[PDB]
């Protein structure tokens, strides 16, 4: 029904 | 009914029976557990961590409060933990995908929560249909502080075990973030600081593998931590 997503994230390239 | 381990007191509360401390323990639990996952899976280098004692017999790396990048993550995880006080947090999870913003995950480390009414013996109903994690946790009884310590130690050793022996190496490129879900009880207005509202969560491919990491049962809360991955065995 309701979710939250962190603005912070971790990237590997 | 208190945890007398000399090392335990640094990171954790000594008593976890009462609701306030039961909830705060859960907050700390989240911090240390995802710390173990982030470090042992090598999503973040060692420099983002501080070596700690969970107990006299177990050490674990935890997110460093003195580093900007790691402090941000820890704060964000702590915001999620505070939601356990009123019982507004159904699930908090680290979601790994091939590309940023993907719905379908390559790998997930999930912690799912259940809540108890006053007294800490009767489980509050959690639904979408009964939430898949409700039944196991609802059957559980708070068996005192030391059981809780042993539960935490199990989870940390399990995370170490999965990453060292079971999980295959992650792909060269990936994107990792934290995704959460609220309970039904949660007001529309209430929002965990650090998490933007969304009508999507994550999904797993149908041939997904799983492994139970461990469960937590303090006085007035319950949780289950699981690993979902395409990279097992």
Automatic annotation (TrEMBL), chain A:
Q: Where is the composition biased (Polar residues)?
A: 1-10
Q: Which residues form a coiled coil?
A: none
Name of this chain's protein: HORMA domain-containing protein
Question: From which organism does this entry originate?
Answer: Caenorhabditis elegans
Automatic annotation (TrEMBL), chain B:
The answer to whether keyword Nucleus applies is yes
Print the keywords alphabetically: Chromosome, Meiosis, Nucleus
GO biological process terms on file? homologous chromosome pairing at meiosis; meiotic chromosome segregation; reciprocal meiotic recombination; regulation of centriole-centriole cohesion
Localization per record: Chromosome; Nucleus
Q: Which GO terms describe its cellular component?
A: chromosome; lateral element; synaptonemal complex
Q: What is its main location?
A: nucleus
Q: Which residues form the HORMA domain?
A: 20-227
What's this protein's name?
HORMA domain-containing protein
Originating gene: htp-1
């Amino acid at each position: 029904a309701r979710y939250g997503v962190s603005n912070t994230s971790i990237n590997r390239k | 009914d208190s945890i007398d381990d000399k090392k335990w007191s640094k990171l954790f509360p000594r008593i976890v029976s009462d609701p306030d401390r039961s909830s705060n323990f859960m907050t700390r639990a989240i911090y240390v557990a995802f710390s173990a996952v982030l470090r042992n899976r090598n999503i973040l280098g060692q420099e983002y961590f501080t070596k700690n004692y969970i107990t006299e017999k177990l050490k674990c790396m935890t997110l460093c409060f003195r580093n900007l990048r790691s402090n941000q993550i820890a704060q964000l995880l702590r915001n999620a933990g505070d939601a356990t006080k009123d019982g507004f947090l159904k699930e908090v999870s680290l979601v790994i995908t091939n590309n940023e913003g993907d719905l379908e995950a390559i790998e997930v480390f999930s912690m799912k929560f259940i809540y108890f009414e006053n007294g800490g013996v009767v489980a509050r109903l959690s639904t979408d249909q009964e939430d898949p994690h409700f039944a196991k946790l609802a059957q559980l009884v708070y068996e005192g502080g030391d059981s809780v310590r042993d539960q935490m130690v199990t989870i940390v050793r399990s995370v170490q075990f999965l990453c060292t022996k079971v999980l295959e190496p992650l792909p060269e490129e990936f994107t990792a973030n934290f995704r959460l879900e609220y309970t039904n009880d949660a007001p529309s207005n209430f929002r965990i600081d650090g998490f933007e509202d969304s009508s999507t969560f994550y999904t797993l491919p149908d041939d997904i593998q799983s492994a139970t990491i461990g469960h937590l049962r303090p006085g007035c809360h319950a949780a289950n931590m699981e690993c979902w991955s395409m990279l097992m065995s």
